[PDB]
Every structure is written in C-alpha cells, then in structure tokens.
Amino acid sequence: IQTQQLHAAMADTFLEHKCRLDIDSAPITARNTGIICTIGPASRSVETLKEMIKSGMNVARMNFSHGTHEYHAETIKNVRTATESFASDPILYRPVAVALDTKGPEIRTGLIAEVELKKGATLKITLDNAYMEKCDENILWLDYKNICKVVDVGSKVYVDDGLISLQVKQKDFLVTEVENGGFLGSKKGVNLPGAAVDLPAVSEKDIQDLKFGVEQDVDMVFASFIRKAADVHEVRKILGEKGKNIKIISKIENHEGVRRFDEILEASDGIMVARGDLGIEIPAEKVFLAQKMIIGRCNRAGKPVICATQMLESMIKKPRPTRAEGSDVANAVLDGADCIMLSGETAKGDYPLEAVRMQHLIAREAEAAMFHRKLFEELARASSQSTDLMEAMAMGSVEASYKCLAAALIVLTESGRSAHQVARYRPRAPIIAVTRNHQTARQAHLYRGIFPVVCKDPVQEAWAEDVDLRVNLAMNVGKARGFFKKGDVVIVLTGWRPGSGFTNTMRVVPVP
Amino acid sequence: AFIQTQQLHAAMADTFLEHKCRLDIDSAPITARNTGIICTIGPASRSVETLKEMIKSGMNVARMNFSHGTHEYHAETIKNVRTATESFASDPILYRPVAVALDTKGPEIRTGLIKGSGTAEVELKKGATLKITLDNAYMEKCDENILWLDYKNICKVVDVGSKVYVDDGLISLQVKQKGPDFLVTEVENGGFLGSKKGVNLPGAAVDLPAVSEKDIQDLKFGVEQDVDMVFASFIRKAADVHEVRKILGEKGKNIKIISKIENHEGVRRFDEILEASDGIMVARGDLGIEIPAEKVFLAQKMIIGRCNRAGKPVICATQMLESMIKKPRPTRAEGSDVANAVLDGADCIMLSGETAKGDYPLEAVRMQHLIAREAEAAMFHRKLFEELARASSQSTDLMEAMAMGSVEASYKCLAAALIVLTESGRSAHQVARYRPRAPIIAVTRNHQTARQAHLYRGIFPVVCKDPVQEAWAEDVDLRVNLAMNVGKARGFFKKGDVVIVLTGWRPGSGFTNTMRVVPVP
Amino acid sequence: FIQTQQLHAAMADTFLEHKCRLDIDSAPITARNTGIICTIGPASRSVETLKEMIKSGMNVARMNFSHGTHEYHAETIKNVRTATESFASDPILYRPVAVALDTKGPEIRTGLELKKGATLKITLDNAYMEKCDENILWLDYKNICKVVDVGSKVYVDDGLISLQVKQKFLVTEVENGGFLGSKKGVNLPGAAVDLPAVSEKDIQDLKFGVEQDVDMVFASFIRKAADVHEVRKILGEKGKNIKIISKIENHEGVRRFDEILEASDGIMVARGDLGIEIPAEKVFLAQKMIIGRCNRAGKPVICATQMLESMIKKPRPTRAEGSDVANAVLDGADCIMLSGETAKGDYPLEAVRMQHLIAREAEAAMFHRKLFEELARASSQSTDLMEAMAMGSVEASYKCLAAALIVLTESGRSAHQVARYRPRAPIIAVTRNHQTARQAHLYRGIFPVVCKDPVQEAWAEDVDLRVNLAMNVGKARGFFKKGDVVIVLTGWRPGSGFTNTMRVVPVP
Ligand code: PRO
Ligand code: PRO
Ligand code: PRO
Ligand SMILES: [K+]
Ligand SMILES: [K+]
Ligand SMILES: [K+]
Ligand SMILES: [Mn+2]
Ligand SMILES: [Mn+2]
Ligand SMILES: [Mn+2]
Ligand code: NA
Ligand code: NA
Ligand code: NA
Ligand code: NA
C-alpha cells in the first residue's frame, strides 16, 4: 500500500483513479488547504486563539455585519496577542492573517424576544421608521427604504437565512402572505431574488469599516455582495494609497455576481464562493454549479478562491460532523479551493477547536486524492498562451517535484509572486515559502500549499550565504513539521543574483 | 494574423487529428536541425575537399562499411574524415565534432565473380534452372547455369522448396533438388546478376558466426583507430551483443555498440538486444528481404518507439533518398520517408549509396537536413512529452526529474535552447530523451562524449578546449558563454532571447542539479 | 499466441504504447479498405492486362488527358469496361470499377542537354515549336513575360532542370541541368500564373467525360472555389452526378484549400507538381493537413504520385516507397494512386499487389479507438441523424470485434457516413445504383456490391434479399463465415432518407 493515494495517482483515467482510492493509504503530514476562521464569542479569547492556531487556523475573519469598531479592534488585538505568543521560535512560528469581512448592501429586519409567523397568515412589510422596534406577527420593518420601487406583484421575500418566505400581494409599504413559516427573530437578514437591489456597493458604514481596516493593518478584505468590477474598484478606492497592498477578495453571493464573474475576477485579488446568500439569491440546487465554475476559473487564473459557509454546520451543536459535511469539505478540496472557511462553527459554536481540527483532517485526505497529473496537464493547457518566465520555472519545478516525488518545494520570495505561481500549478508536496516580508507571509495563506515562514535574520553581505541561510531555515521548518527528514529530496527555488526579479534557479537538494 | 514558426499553432492542438489539420507550409522552421545525420563514406565522398563540404552540409557521423574494403582503405578514409574535420578547428565557436562509426561485415552471404566470357552480367530467366555450387573453381566463373556463393554450410540449412534471394532481394530462386555439396534451383523472379551480390535465406536458421574472424580483426582495428561507435550487423540476440562487447574489451569499453536489426529473430528478441545495446539501427535493407517488405514499417515504428521509451539512440537506415544516387532531387515517397522517420522519433537518419557511390552526395546530405527541420517542428511535442513521462513514471531518478523540469520549462517560455554542461554525456542524454523542440547545446571537455552525442536527437555538442578554472563558479560561467557564443554564431538565438541552463551546483555532483532560465547576453 | 490485426496495439492507452506494440507477427485481415486508383497507359491498356489489374486490386481507372486524343482514351475506357464486365456473370464476386477523367488543365510545356551556368533563350515565337535546341527553347505560355521577375526561377521536366530569369522574350541562366527531351512540363513556383482554369482543351475533354459516362473528374491545378464552380458549370445538368475531385498541386491550392474543399466532392494530394511548386521538404505537411481536413469533413481524399516510383523498372520497391504507402494509409487517405507505375512501367501488376499488401498492414496498425474519438469531437457541432447512426454502428462494431458493416444505400450517402467514422471492419454497401457503386471506391472501407434484382413487392422482403446478398458476398470473399457477427444498417420503411435501423446480426 503506497501512501498519499499514489496508486490512484498512477491511473490513466479519472474512473480508474477513483476505483483506486484507498482508505488504508495514509495522507502525508503536510496540509495544503488554507483554513479561515470567523472569530466571535466562542473564539475571541487569547487562550482559545492559541489553540485555534495550534489546531490549524491560518486566517482570522472579522464579520462586520455586527459588532462595533471597539469590539472588532479588541478581537484583532486578541488574535495578534495569541499569534505573537509563538514569535520567539522561528522554526514553529505561524503567521496568522487578519481578514475584514464587510457588511455591504444588506437588508436586515428590526427589533421585536421572538414572534411566530404562521403559514398562510398575512404579514405587513413597512418602512415607517417608527416601527423599527415594534415588529410582530402583523407588522414587519426592514431597513431598505426603496424596497417598493424594486419588487413586483408576485415577488418573493425571504427572511432569516432564507428559512421564512413571503409573497408580495399588494403595494411605501408591502402587504405579503406567508408561504414558508417559522419563528422570527431580531435583526434577521432579508433576500430579494430576481429583484435588482439598488443599495450602494459601498455604504457610509462600509467606507468607515474599510478605512478602519487600513488603520488596523488588515491583510485582506472580504467584500460582500460584489456584483461587478465597479464594485471592486470602489472598495479599491477607499483602501487607497496607504492600503494598496491589502488584497480584495470578492464575495460572489448573488446571480449578478455569477453573471459578471470574469470581470470581478480580473478586478479582484481573490474570490469567495459565499454559498449562504448565494443559495438564497439563486436556487439552492444550483449552488454547486457556481462553486465548481468559480473554483475552476480561479485555478485557471492563479487567484485564491475560498469555499465558505455551512461546511460543517451541525458542529455548532455536536462534536462530530455529518456525512454530507465530510463529503462537502473533501469535494471543495477536490474542486480546487485554495481555502476553506468556518463561520458559526467557530464564531459561536460549542466545538470551535473541533471544527478546525476536522477541516485540517479532511483537507489532507482530499489533497492526496486529487488527480495531480491530469490537473497539471489541464492547467498547463489553460495557461498555454502565456510564455511567462516565472510560470516556466514554476511548471518545471512542479513537474520536477512529481517525477522524483519530492518532499517539499522551497521558495524564497519577497513579493510572494514566485510562491504564488508555484502554488497555481498544484504540486502535491507543500510549498515552504521563506520571506523577510511579514505581510507577504500572512497573505501567502490564501494560496493552496504555501507554508509561509518568516525569516527575521539580518541580510548577509554575501548573496549565496544569505540564500543558504533562508533555505536552511525551511529545511529546519520542514523537519520539525514532519514534512521531511535528512536524506529526502526537495525542490529549491531561488534568485541567482540579488537583482533577479523572480526565482530563476531551481535545484534538487538532499535534505541535510 | 501572425503565422507562428516551428508549427507552434499545431503545437497547441488538443487532438492528434487537429494537430495534423493545423500543419502549415507557411510556418517557417527554426535554424537548428535536431536529427543526427549519418553518412556512409565511399568513392563518392572520400576526398578531403568533399568531406569538408559534407560537414558543411550537415554530416555528423561518417560511416565505414566493412563488408567492403581493406583496412588500408578504411584507415585512409578515417584519416581523410579527420583531416576534413580538423580543418575547421581554428574556430572553436564554429567547429563541429564528427563521429566515426564502424559498420561490420557480420554473417554475410555473397556470390562470386561473373566469368569473363559473355555479357557483363548474366540473365537469370523466369523458369530456368540455376545450380548453386560451393566448388571454389567457379568462384570467379559464375553465370546463368552455375552460381557460386561463400556460405560453405548452406546445404545444411535449406530444404527442397526453400527460397534463396539474390541482389537486394530482386532475384528469387526456389530450391528444387538438394545435393550434399550443391543445390538445383528454379528462378521465380528473373533479373540481371552482377558480381558479389547479396544473398538472403529468410526461412532458414543460418549458422554463420555473429562475429567472424574477419569481424574480430575488424573490431580490434576499430579499437586501434579510435572509432566512436560500432554498427553491428545481423544481431539476432543479446549474446551477439555480449560477444562484440567482449572483443571491444577493456580498451574499447567506451565505444558504443549499435545493434543492427535486420532479421526476424532480431525483431522477436528485440528487448534483450536493446537492454544489452547502447543503441539500435533499423537496418531496413536486409530487414525488407528477411521479413516481408510490407511489414518493415511496423517493425521500424515498434523499434523507434521502444528506444524512445528507453532513452537509447535509434537510427533509421537504408534507401531513404535512394533515387538521389542518379537524380538531383528525391521522389515524393522519399521525402515522406525522411519526414515520417523524424516524426516516428528517430534520433538519427542515414544515407548509404546516396553518399557512398552516388552522383549527388552533397545534395542528398542537404535534403535530409531540410526535411528534418520541417518534421521536427511538425511533431506533437506536448503529447510526446506526456506519453514519455507516463512510460517512465515508475522511475523517480533525479536527473530525469531535472530533465523533465527543464524540457517542460522550455515548452512554456519557448526557450531558444537548452545549455547543458556534461562530462560523460548522461545529463545531456536524459534531456534529449524528453524531446524538447529547442536545441540542446551540450558543452563538454570530453572529446569522445562530444562525438557520441550526435547519436541523440537535438544534442548540439561543443568541445571546450579551455583549462579548468580554479573557482567552480567561473568554470561553469565560462562554459555557458561558450554555448552562448556558439548559439549566436550558429543563428540559434540572439540577445534578449531565453535559454534554459543546466549546470552542476558544486564540482562533486554526478549530474546537473541546477536549472536556470537565463537571457542571452 | 498473438492476436490478429494489431489488436494488442489496438488496446494501448497512448500513441507511444501503440507504436511499441506494433507486431509483425500479427496477421492482417483479408479485407482491404484503402482504394487503389490506377493510371492507365501503354503498359496497362490491353484487356488481358486490365483483367489482372482488377484481379490484383484496381478499383479506379484513371485516364490522363495531359496526353493523347479523344479516340485513344475512348479505346482505353472501352477496354476498361470490357475487362470489368468479363466478371459480371457472378454478381457475388463481381467488382465494380470506376472511370476517372483527369484534366490537362493549365499546363505549360516545352517544344521538340543543358550545362550549369549556361545562357538559354526562352521564346514564345511559334516558328521554333518543333526545333528546340541547347540555346533556344520554345514553350506554349503567352503571358509568361508578364508574370515572371528578374531572379525568379523556371523549372523544366518534372522539376529536374532549373533556370533563373535574367532579362525580359526571356534569357535565362541554367542552374541544375540534365538530358532535355520532347514536350516537357514547365513550372513557375510563386509566380501567379493566369492561364484559364478550365481551357477550351478542357471544356472539350470534360464534355467527352459526360458522353463517356465517367464517374469522377480529377481537376488539375485547382486554385480556388471559383475553379471548382467552373468545372461544375461545364459539366452542366447532364453531368451533375459526376463527382469532382480537386487536385491540390500549387501554393494557392493549399492557401485557399478550405473554400476548395467545401466546393469539391473530394481531393487529391497531387504530390509531383506540389513538390515542384513548394519546397519538396514541405510536401508531407500539406499532405497530412489536407488528409486530416478531408477526414474531418468526410470527403474522399487520394494520396498520389511517386508512391512506388522505382517499380517502374524494378519488381520490388525501395524501403522509402514501402514506408510512404503505409504512412499514407496511417495518415487517413481514402485512396492511394499509381501513375507511371501502372501507366508505362515494366511491372504494373506487382505495383498494384504491393499497394494492396501494404494497405492491409497499415490499416490494422491505425489507432482506431483514438481516431474515432477525435473525429466525433471535430464533428460534434453536427447532430445529423445519419451521422448519429453511423457513429453508433462503428462504435458497436469496435465493441464486438464485428466482421463487417452491411449498409443499404441508393445515393451512397449512408455508406459514406459509416466510412467517415473509420471502422476497422469492411463496409459492404449494397446499391441498385450502378454509378453509386462505382463512386463508392473513393471511400475508405466501402466494398460496393451491385444489386441487379428488381425492387420487391414487400419492403421487408427487399431488405432481407439485399442483406442476404451482402452475406453471400462476404462469405465468398472470406471476410466472414457462419457464426461471425455483423453490424447491419437498413431503413425501417421505404421512404426513409437514410439507414435508421441498426442490428447486430449473426452470419448464417
Ligand atoms: O501555512 C499554513 O498552515 C497554510 C497551509 C495552506 C495555506 N497556508
Ligand atoms: O550537432 C549536430 O549538428 C547534430 C544535430 C543533432 C545531433 N547532432
Ligand atoms: O472495394 C474495394 O475493394 C475497395 C475498398 C476501398 C474502396 N473500394
Ligand atoms: K459580512
Ligand atoms: K555492413
Ligand atoms: K493531367
Ligand atoms: Mn453573505
Ligand atoms: Mn544489412
Ligand atoms: Mn499535376
Ligand atoms: Na518573488
Ligand atoms: Na562477363
Ligand atoms: Na553528466
Ligand atoms: Na441513403
């Protein structure tokens, strides 16, 4: 029994490949898929974040749909306090990125406690701001003022993560009938599929939240409800000069987002399949189509793509996930997502560490299960119009890593660019990317297979010696992490001279 | 639009059919010619002044056919080759190494001399009786009634109704009666018989020695004359290779043994021959007589296939531009034969009569050169590369990894060349194996390694005459710039183009473990 | 134990493993799918010779109208039919034979020994057309001086001699030289020649072909779509069922091939003149591209010229000629052609037999699984029902190692679709249309069988009768025997405009 699903790897067809998947074929130790965790009251303590980091967390997400600047700043500080609790040991230190997830053009309800909305029983949507806090089973207020100009006779309104549904019967108010009932809570989200919502891509709140992200030196923004390239560019404008290096990950979570997908991709730095609202804005049975289309097209462009939301939902209450949840994580990884995400499971659930641990474990099994040879061939075909020198290095290196079954790839990188181009070509072996730039190290977490290492050492006067310094750091990192041992082979990627604008030098080195 | 060079639009096809359908006559080929060109030297090409023009036309390997000629003759030819080759040595940047190969007589069956009385040749007529004798009194008195041949033990291997073939299988006899010391035959295929013509017995187990006393002396003489390779005739099994090896011995251990496949038995036992050999020749002339002629292409394609799979050199040989012995231009089939052989994957292609005795030896050499570049571009590299990888994928060898990584990287940035620093040749050899479309400029201080490199598709050997620089860094750099200068002068690339450079990181390495993309300065 | 028909290689995953598995000890099947077209001249024109020509494998008789009179070719055509019809007593083993008129077209030619670097006077004066000399040569091109430049080259006699234009009458310097003779072909590569595409000498020959009941025209030096439409206009209403095979033999033919292919009913790679018009080292490029594009559109393609050239004087071919034939079949050519080999050679019978033997070796050595998959993909925009039925039948033939496909057809179009998808098993095509059966020899695999019985009362009875005739033909010619499996394509009801019914039927 070969490890790392290598028998399946040798197969000629996809059918064969699958018939060959073996439960007794141990994954390797390295974990290539990044894990993004929404932080909240279950996970907001220094103490729990230490454990979250140890469990697998690479990126911490701040959900700006709730909480004040004060509250979010403290959390950020808590994440950093915990991340830095490991700073003294360069061999084990894990950078941890901070992510800002914006509110965007949300429609939420008001205050009431709880109220029940029965199947068939009429309900009245109003915008009269006197009822902001006087909602019940007769009267329902939401904060979207122009709701009336955008919906038709026979339109549907979904309330509370799509659980409750309503049909608009007559016309600054709407009178609806309950189609799908439930219990109605305070400040629950509202969706209007088929309606072309005209709230700003970026509201005042958003603008203040984005500016705040700048001040807080966040590494990336998760931009909610992006519909078009112009939305992305608005977000880019607010971040401005001081924040030019923060990556904009666009959230695809409505029909228009999907329609205009190519342009959003081009304009953005990465993408998030935000399946929550997506499954409400379009039929839920269609979501997998979008997941797969998006991940595919992001792989093709070499830009990070994140599969999110409800991936291990039941784990909010139970210590073990469901069979559907297991399969969902694996398939997201087989689809080619760079990152997978936890929301409620870590923000508020009863088993936050467990959820992180489960993602870590499923990631490795599915990583080994990919059909690397065909995937490599297909990505090469897709990028074949480009003759880029760094792509050439990356492909040669990856192909080199497949042939000799290298234990890792070692990339020296300042901008991160060399590392990213290696990642996009999907080697099985982890990419240990050594960098003197802390932000690059943090942002590298967006890319499948990059294990970032911060090098704190001063630069040596001799280039070769400074280079050897950084490779040996990765050698030491790779060994403490159980990636390799003395006598294994790794691919190494460096600049020949200090002026080399990319890793133009590849080597097969034995691990010392 | 822009029409891409080197059939690069056809290179991007997803199917073999679309690749065919994208082939473009207006897609100009590159200047590098990757297919090694082997020329049989003879009266047509022996002079020093003609050999120089053979080199300028593209000859990489001069072949000495030991079925004819004394040692005094071949030593003069080999001298002439080296005189011609060294006339160019004054320009290290332009000088082209030239390999010397010894093609052995082997277990050949030949007829005698036609008698003086009568016509120059005889007419063997369909339905007429011809007797075959071993009586040495007729060895120079052959005619229509009585034919002498040199296989003394012929009577022990043929039967009544056996077929004896004569003169490149143009003339066939059927054995009608068997005598102890003679055969009575009937002519099935008529024709005009000259002297010392080739005889084949396809349905017979010929007991002649794989390596005869003549071959032995011929081999030893090969060793004393510092030939780079041996083309061993009529190799039937592995033990035939081991015998040639034994004879070449310790002194000739770096001499490459190319096994010539030309009988059914050599095709049946090909694998054990390949393992034992340094390379193979599809020696089609005899093969097309021993097995049915309509079956030769199957064997040719199987062999070229299996040597590609194994990383061993293969040569397509025989009658490729045959008509150019008397005509300035080839036929349309001949043009196709050269191209399809290159497409098959042949590392080298060869010329026999076309350079040995022909009227147009320079024009023959030039034509192979021009076809080879057309077909080299017309190959389906992306699919060739994928399929060679799959067949070798049980190997995790480090040099193959470097080789695969370098070729892949050359496909992606469309490198103008791969530079390879090598002493034994192994590093270059393994790159060649994986079939980049760019040329492989191999730099070596080992002169023999340079000459042997012609056996491998794409390797453009370059002799480094400079002393070993003290710092390993400067010694590597020196050998890169040489390849840079060679490349530029030869028109393979210019400033601003990109090459893939393969080097050793430290002196100790036993293979190129360093790959770079580097701009030409 | 070795599987027949290269079936071990048929099972390879990659192109390389397919090559590596090719087995000389793997026996080919009896049937031969690549059509043999044979140029008929003084060596082959007699009835007795022609009978053996048909016996050895000739399917198409080609008359070359570059030479000879209407009276001469009429005698040749007359002898072809006599030979052919001498077999008509046995409708089982009778082999239909097709007659092709190959047009002179826009030739240039000399009148009635040249040293390298010697000056030669080219003139158009009709006072020299019978006394051509060392220093004065006459040709029949009038516009020549308007289409050639200083420095441009002119080639004489199958491109053997080269002469560079030095001054405008034309004075030239010989480059390559040899023995010069009577009425020798002239080529002007890369100079746009403006001779009529279909001359008066052509329009007379084409009309002759209609009257002479020929099945296909091979239209020489086809440059563009217009040119095919001209040959099509000339053939007129009476000659509408005659197929037009356009001959690709100059740079523009290749340049504009696509519009030509759409306009033509088939294509010949006319290699001789092509290897004179473009660098000869490029010919294989144009050959493979062309065959591929024809394969794709499912229009017949003939590979032609010099395939067995040395057999003009020798009983056995060179290895380069062997190789050429097999690679032509592996390329995908529907038909292969002999010229000088059968027209004037010393061994026209042996040349036919070697094309036959070479064909069957190479036909088995095709990589059918990959070829089918690649044809389907390229034709995937088409949803045509006959194509659907064809593809399903070929697929079914592959899966059960079926001994043959039996196709019933009047237009031939159903059989043409089957052939196009390249089964390894032969296609027995039964037709009451004598001209359909003759034109079928243009398509890979199609073994046309003439039905001479009248249309039966019951539609089902008429189908069984035709299918049983196809079984009888197959069994007599050793394609299959009792218990073998065949794919059988028929129409369900009389009015079906194609074979909509497919069966796996046992051979009785
Ligand atoms: O460094 C890590 O742990 C993760 C692995 C994939 C992206 N970054
Ligand atoms: O260097 C040369 O000229 C030839 C080309 C490939 C093999 N050697
Ligand atoms: O019937 C025959 O013999 C040939 C086979 C291919 C075309 N016609
Ligand atoms: K949000
Ligand atoms: K020999
Ligand atoms: K003609
Ligand atoms: Mn959302
Ligand atoms: Mn031989
Ligand atoms: Mn022609
Ligand atoms: Na970089
Ligand atoms: Na004599
Ligand atoms: Na070496
Ligand atoms: Na039909």
The residues facing B463 across adjacent strands are B444
Phi and psi at A198, nearest 5°, equal -115, 25
Collapsing DSSP states into helix, strand and coil, what is residue B478?
helix
What is the token pair recorded at B484? Answer: 């840079």
Q: What is the CA radius of gyration of chain A?
A: 24
B1-32+376-521, CATH topology level:
Pyruvate Kinase; Chain: A, domain 1 (3.40.1380)
At how many degrees (to 10) do helices C283-297 and C368-378 cross? 70
- Closest among C201, C190, C148 to C170, alpha carbons compared: C148
B33-106+210-375, CATH topology level:
TIM Barrel (3.20.20)
Phi and psi at C242, nearest 5°, equal -75, 125
Residue type, C177: G
- Closest among C255, C231, C234 to C244, alpha carbons compared: C231
Q: Which residues contact B207 (CB under 8 A, 6 or more apart)?
A: B153, B156, B157
CA separation for the pair B490, A482 (Å, rounded): 50
Residue A317 CB neighbours (<10 A) = 9
B359 touches chain C (CB under 8 A): no
CA separation for the pair A224, A203 (Å, rounded): 12
DSSP state of B413: T
CA separation for the pair C402, C387 (Å, rounded): 19
Do residues B402 and C30 lie in contact, with contact meaning Cβ atoms separated by under 8 Å?
A: no
Residue located via tokens 């399903």: C392
Q: Which residues contact B69 (CB under 8 A, 6 or more apart)?
A: B77
Pairs of CB atoms within 8 A across A/B: 80
Residue type, A416: G
CA A375 from centre of chain: 21
Domain A105-200 is classified in which CATH homologous superfamily?
PK beta-barrel domain-like (2.40.33.10)
DSSP conformation letters of B49-106: HHHHHHHHHT--EEEEETTS--HHHHHHHHHHHHHHHHTTTT-TTT----EEEEE---
Mutate to test the interface with A, among B413, B430, B476, B520 (most CBs of A within 10 A): B413
Do residues A245 and A278 lie in contact, with contact meaning Cβ atoms separated by under 8 Å?
A: no
- Closest among A29, A45, A80 to A346, alpha carbons compared: A45
C32-105+197-362, CATH topology level:
TIM Barrel (3.20.20)
Q: Say if ligand 3 is within 6 A of residue C156 CB.
A: no
Burial class (CB in 10 A: 0-12, 13-18, 19+), A89: exposed
Measured CA to CA in angstroms, residue B211 lies from A264, A507, B87, B158 at distances of: 74, 46, 36, 22
Strands A97-101 and A107-108: unpaired
The residues facing B171 across adjacent strands are B166
- Closest among B360, B367, B380 to B338, alpha carbons compared: B367
CA separation for the pair C352, C54 (Å, rounded): 9
| Helix H or strand E segment including C210 | helix C200-211
What is the token pair recorded at A398? Answer: 């990856």
Active site residues of B: 63, 110, 260, 318
A1-30+367-512, CATH topology level:
Pyruvate Kinase; Chain: A, domain 1 (3.40.1380)
User: Looking at chain A, which residues constitute the CATH 3.20.20.60 domain(s)?
Assistant: 31-104+201-366
Do residues A47 and A81 lie in contact, with contact meaning Cβ atoms separated by under 8 Å?
A: no
Domain C1-31+363-508 is classified in which CATH homologous superfamily?
Pyruvate kinase, C-terminal domain (3.40.1380.20)
User: Looking at chain C, which residues constitute the CATH 2.40.33.10 domain(s)?
Assistant: 106-196
Is B397 in contact with A391 (Cβ distance < 8 A)?
A: no
CA separation for the pair C110, C179 (Å, rounded): 13
Residue A288 CB neighbours (<10 A) = 15
CA separation for the pair B298, C330 (Å, rounded): 11
Measured CA to CA in angstroms, residue C112 lies from A317, A433, B452, C180, C181 at distances of: 104, 81, 54, 10, 7
Do residues A321 and A312 lie in contact, with contact meaning Cβ atoms separated by under 8 Å?
A: yes
CA separation for the pair B131, B113 (Å, rounded): 15
C106-196, CATH topology level:
M1 Pyruvate Kinase; Domain 3 (2.40.33)
Do residues B171 and B124 lie in contact, with contact meaning Cβ atoms separated by under 8 Å?
A: yes
- Closest among B366, B358, B371, B452 to B54, alpha carbons compared: B366
CA separation for the pair A407, A488 (Å, rounded): 7
CA separation for the pair C119, C165 (Å, rounded): 10
Measured CA to CA in angstroms, residue A453 lies from A27, A91, A444, A478 at distances of: 23, 8, 10, 10
CA separation for the pair A400, A395 (Å, rounded): 8
Check if CATH label 3.10.20.30 holds for domain B107-209. Answer: no
Q: Tell me the CATH number for domain A31-104+201-366.
A: 3.20.20.60
Do residues A324 and A357 lie in contact, with contact meaning Cβ atoms separated by under 8 Å?
A: no
Contacts of B404 in chain A (CB under 8 A): 399-400, 403
Burial class (CB in 10 A: 0-12, 13-18, 19+), A137: middle
Residue located via tokens 């147009």: B360
Phi and psi at B253, nearest 5°, equal -70, -30
What is the token pair recorded at B339? Answer: 């191209």
Mutate to test the interface with B, among A4, A422, A508 (most CBs of B within 10 A): A508
Do residues A392 and B413 lie in contact, with contact meaning Cβ atoms separated by under 8 Å?
A: yes
| Helix H or strand E segment including A457 | none
Q: Say if ligand 1 is within 6 A of residue A451 CB.
A: yes
CA separation for the pair B126, C70 (Å, rounded): 38
Measured CA to CA in angstroms, residue A21 lies from A325, B201, B395, B423 at distances of: 20, 55, 22, 44
Helix %, strand %, coil % of chain A (to 5): 40, 20, 40
Residue type, A47: E
CA separation for the pair C110, C123 (Å, rounded): 10
Find the residue in C nearest to B344 (Cα). Answer: C19
What is the token pair recorded at A12? Answer: 């000629």
Residue type, A396: G
Q: Which residues contact A309 (CB under 8 A, 6 or more apart)?
A: A274, A275, A276, A341, A343
- Closest among B95, B23, B33 to B438, alpha carbons compared: B33
Is B412 in contact with A405 (Cβ distance < 8 A)?
A: no
Collapsing DSSP states into helix, strand and coil, what is residue A283?
coil
CA separation for the pair B8, B11 (Å, rounded): 5
Q: Which residues contact A216 (CB under 8 A, 6 or more apart)?
A: A72, A73, A76, A98, A100
Q: Which residues contact B249 (CB under 8 A, 6 or more apart)?
A: B223
Do residues A383 and A394 lie in contact, with contact meaning Cβ atoms separated by under 8 Å?
A: no
How far does residue B11's CA lie from ligand 10's centre (Å)? Answer: 30
Resolution (A): 2.4
Residue located via tokens 């012995």: B325
Strands B163-166 and B171-178: antiparallel
Measured CA to CA in angstroms, residue C259 lies from B299, C223, C256, C262, C264 at distances of: 39, 10, 6, 5, 9
Residue located via tokens 């040249």: C114
CA separation for the pair A130, B172 (Å, rounded): 114
Do residues A122 and A140 lie in contact, with contact meaning Cβ atoms separated by under 8 Å?
A: no
DSSP state of A105: S
User: Looking at chain B, which residues constitute the CATH 3.20.20.60 domain(s)?
Assistant: 33-106+210-375
How far does residue B453's CA lie from ligand 8's centre (Å)? Answer: 24
CA separation for the pair C209, C100 (Å, rounded): 8
Dihedral of the alpha carbons of C209, C212, C214, C219, in degrees to the nearest 10: -10
| Helix H or strand E segment including C247 | strand C243-248
- Closest among A274, A104, A111, A107 to A191, alpha carbons compared: A107
DSSP state of A143: S
Per residue, what are the HEC states of A42-59?
CCCCHHHHHHHHHHCCCE
CA separation for the pair C73, C96 (Å, rounded): 20
B48 touches chain A (CB under 8 A): no
CA separation for the pair C120, C133 (Å, rounded): 9
Do residues C202 and C233 lie in contact, with contact meaning Cβ atoms separated by under 8 Å?
A: no
CA distance A425 to chain B (A): 13
Do residues B99 and B39 lie in contact, with contact meaning Cβ atoms separated by under 8 Å?
A: no
User: Looking at chain C, which residues constitute the CATH 3.40.1380.20 domain(s)?
Assistant: 1-31+363-508
DSSP strands (E only) in A458-504:
489-494
Sign of CA dihedral A179, A183, A187, A188: negative
Dihedral of the alpha carbons of B318, B319, B321, B322, in degrees to the nearest 10: 140
Q: Which ligand is nearest to the CA of A222?
A: 4
Residue A466 CB neighbours (<10 A) = 17
Do residues B182 and B132 lie in contact, with contact meaning Cβ atoms separated by under 8 Å?
A: yes
DSSP conformation letters of B442-502: EEES-HHHHHHGGGSTTEEEEE--S---SSHHHHHHHHHHHHHHHHHHTTS--TT-EEEEE
B393 touches chain A (CB under 8 A): yes
CA separation for the pair A4, A366 (Å, rounded): 10
CA separation for the pair C488, C470 (Å, rounded): 10
C313 touches chain B (CB under 8 A): no
CA B292 from centre of chain: 22
CA separation for the pair A39, A34 (Å, rounded): 16
Burial class (CB in 10 A: 0-12, 13-18, 19+), C475: middle
Q: Which residues contact A66 (CB under 8 A, 6 or more apart)?
A: none
Q: How many residues does chain C have?
A: 508
For chain B, the straight-line distance linking the first and the last C-alpha, in angstroms and rounded, comes to: 30
| Helix H or strand E segment including C331 | helix C319-331
Which residue's CA is the closest to the ligand 1 atom numbered 6? A34
CA separation for the pair B514, B480 (Å, rounded): 13
Which technique? X-ray
